[PDB]
Enzyme design. Structure first.
Site, PDB file in Angstrom:
ATOM      1  N   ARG A   1      -0.124 -11.608  -0.371  1.00 12.34           N
ATOM      2  CA  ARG A   1       0.746 -12.381   0.560  1.00 12.34           C
ATOM      3  C   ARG A   1      -0.071 -13.862   0.642  1.00 12.34           C
ATOM      4  NH1 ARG A   1      -1.902  -9.622   4.689  1.00 12.34           N
ATOM      5  NH2 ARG A   1      -3.616 -10.783   5.875  1.00 12.34           N
TER       6      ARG A   1
ATOM      7  N   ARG B   1      -2.688   4.959  -1.834  1.00 13.36           N
ATOM      8  CA  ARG B   1      -3.005   3.664  -1.234  1.00 13.36           C
ATOM      9  C   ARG B   1      -2.657   2.813  -2.471  1.00 13.36           C
ATOM     10  NH1 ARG B   1      -4.422   1.214   3.066  1.00 13.36           N
ATOM     11  NH2 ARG B   1      -5.831  -0.610   3.140  1.00 13.36           N
TER      12      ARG B   1
ATOM     13  N   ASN C   1      -4.170  -5.573  -2.491  1.00 13.85           N
ATOM     14  CA  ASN C   1      -4.290  -6.571  -1.403  1.00 13.85           C
ATOM     15  C   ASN C   1      -5.659  -7.071  -1.432  1.00 13.85           C
ATOM     16  OD1 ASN C   1      -2.563  -7.827   0.802  1.00 13.85           O
ATOM     17  ND2 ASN C   1      -3.851  -6.714   2.241  1.00 13.85           N
TER      18      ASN C   1
ATOM     19  N   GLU D   1       1.954  -6.094  10.682  1.00 11.76           N
ATOM     20  CA  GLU D   1       1.133  -4.725  10.675  1.00 11.76           C
ATOM     21  C   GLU D   1       1.722  -4.072  11.996  1.00 11.76           C
ATOM     22  OE1 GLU D   1      -2.691  -4.985   8.811  1.00 11.76           O
ATOM     23  OE2 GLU D   1      -1.875  -3.753   7.675  1.00 11.76           O
TER      24      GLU D   1
ATOM     25  N   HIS E   1       0.866  -1.062   0.033  1.00 19.64           N
ATOM     26  CA  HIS E   1      -0.004  -0.018  -0.119  1.00 19.64           C
ATOM     27  C   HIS E   1       0.998   1.186  -0.229  1.00 19.64           C
ATOM     28  CE1 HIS E   1      -3.599  -2.260   1.890  1.00 19.64           C
ATOM     29  NE2 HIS E   1      -3.528  -2.443   0.712  1.00 19.64           N
TER      30      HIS E   1
END
Ligand SMILES: [Zn+2]
Ligand SMILES: [Zn+2]
EC number: 3.5.1.15
Lengths: 302, 302
Positions: B160, B55, B62, B170, B13
């Site tokens: 991922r 973003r 994602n 995160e 991002h």
């Protein structure tokens, strides 16, 4: 002259929300800020940059309230924010005109750890200082600070720069795109309480002269960049969230990812401000180095 | 089964930067991330969104590593992300196939005060549970809370998820496009234990049975809307910065400018996560409501 028309601008930077939110309401049920004598006008400046929720859409509306921009002519083509500063000149301006507001507020929010921050434009602003002096006071115990932009150059292009007596209000820290109910009040303390000093003064009440010793922008600090392009050493874990505080020669500044530090030049003390501010990253800017320089005025009556 | 291909994805991002910086630094010297008997390729996933501090460009990268997007053949009209996804699925894929990469760590910063967060998609699956445990203990004595995305559907679309063993990393709080020396350090340490980890495991370290406390999303709680649709209330003050901590039925959950307070509801304890995330206004949700449930893993050994 005297006083008259008053404005509260919210939305210059579209993704600075606690500065913006409140205005949307003060157009919905504005009973929340209208007093019994004084007149205040709440306005959202960049509607489009608010909706997207994004700093700007074409260009920084905050750097275009002046001849240079205002003066440019009509082309539905021109960058959105331009035409916008232009028109804005009719509602609360034009700038340098006479019918144009004398008290407008350009509300903002930062990511740097700054807390209450009033921004002074020209230093020779006797009044503004009594106020910037009467705000800091009306604030304790909650901390408030005064930032000065002394353009020797002598010319401003800010949104708030249309008014006789401009006033910048900024509150940190509030990540762009977020709305913290805490910041939506870490600042309410001067506005509806300012809408006061802009009424009461009328009664012609007086205070002894004034000398707010402020911190003045004197030189912006660059980001130590590696080679190919990318950064190299970032704001140190000692300067981080340390605005308005001293940064002597040892004081760390930038920390390199490989573990090293990069201290301060000179041997004179400074109080960094705007430390780690989101926006200005495209500018390769880490912070503005400041000397806690002085500001004396003179008494005032109404 | 022995691990071989390990990639650390960053820049997934664009606002999020701790990974853009970390990945790059390693892309110049992975000594800190290279291990004996393993291949760790740091890689930037969204080069462009990284350049326009967005973003992203067209849509999130994602949310598209699924068969709908994956079933599309490369082209011009094909929007940017859909195109880049494939190249990653080409490079680190094809998907759900053993023909592809083993473990992938994708870094993400959040505006919520949540610190070190590990993101697990499916629970029942003994492999990837011990890993997190080793991290919880090796990264101590700071919380290193773990978040779960139990999809009874049994499906995921995270960049991922190409890996046979996806791991989300995160860390918050570190504003979008503002890199803080500290945040970068927590993540720096999370990755260590994770890379090294695979290393002693690969070198046959035996592991005894263990268990981990986790939080399952059980209700995306929303910010009150207005007459039409605008954000009425907001996250409450006293809750702000309290991700992972206990939230009972009558405690403050929201607030309105007229000083009004809105309570939780239901008849049980919840653990608000992602309390006031910048992207949440966009992904909608004032915060995530979750349950703390236990995962018990079986002892594993390479
Ligand atoms: Zn601003
Ligand atoms: Zn992210």
């Amino acid at each position: 002259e005297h006083i008259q028309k008053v404005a509260i601008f919210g939305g210059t930077h579209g993704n600075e929300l606690t500065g913006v939110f409140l205005v949307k309401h003060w157009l919905e049920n504005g009973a929340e800020i209208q007093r019994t004598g004084l007149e205040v006008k709440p306005f959202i400046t960049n509607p489009r940059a608010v909706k997207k929720c994004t700093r700007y859409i074409d260009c920084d509306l905050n750097r275009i309230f002046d001849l240079e921009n205002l003066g440019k002519k009509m082309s539905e083509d021109l960058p959105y924010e331009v035409r916008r500063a232009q028109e804005i000149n009719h509602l609360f301006g034009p700038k340098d005109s006479e019918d144009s507001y004398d008290i407008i507020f350009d509300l903002h929010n930062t990511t740097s750890n700054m807390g209450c921050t009033l921004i002074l434009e020209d230093s020779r602003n006797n009044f503004l200082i009594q106020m910037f002096h009467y705000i800091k006071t009306s604030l304790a115990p909650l901390p408030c600070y005064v930032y000065l932009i002394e353009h020797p150059s002598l010319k401003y292009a800010t949104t708030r720069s249309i008014a006789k007596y401009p006033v910048g209000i900024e509150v940190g820290p509030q990540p762009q795109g977020v709305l913290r109910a805490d910041i939506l009040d870490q600042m309410r303390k001067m506005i509806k309480h300012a809408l006061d000093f802009i009424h009461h003064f009328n009664e012609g009440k007086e205070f002894p002269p004034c000398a707010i010793e402020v911190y003045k922008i004197i030189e912006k600090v660059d980001y130590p960049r590696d080679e190919n392009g990318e950064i190299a050493a970032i704001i140190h874990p000692n300067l981080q969230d340390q605005d308005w505080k001293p940064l002597h020669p040892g004081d760390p500044m930038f920390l390199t990812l490989d573990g090293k530090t990069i201290p301060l030049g000179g041997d004179c003390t400074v109080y960094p401000v705007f430390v780690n501010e989101a926006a200005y990253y495209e500018k390769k800017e880490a912070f503005a180095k400041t000397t806690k320089l002085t500001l004396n005025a003179k008494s005032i009556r109404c």
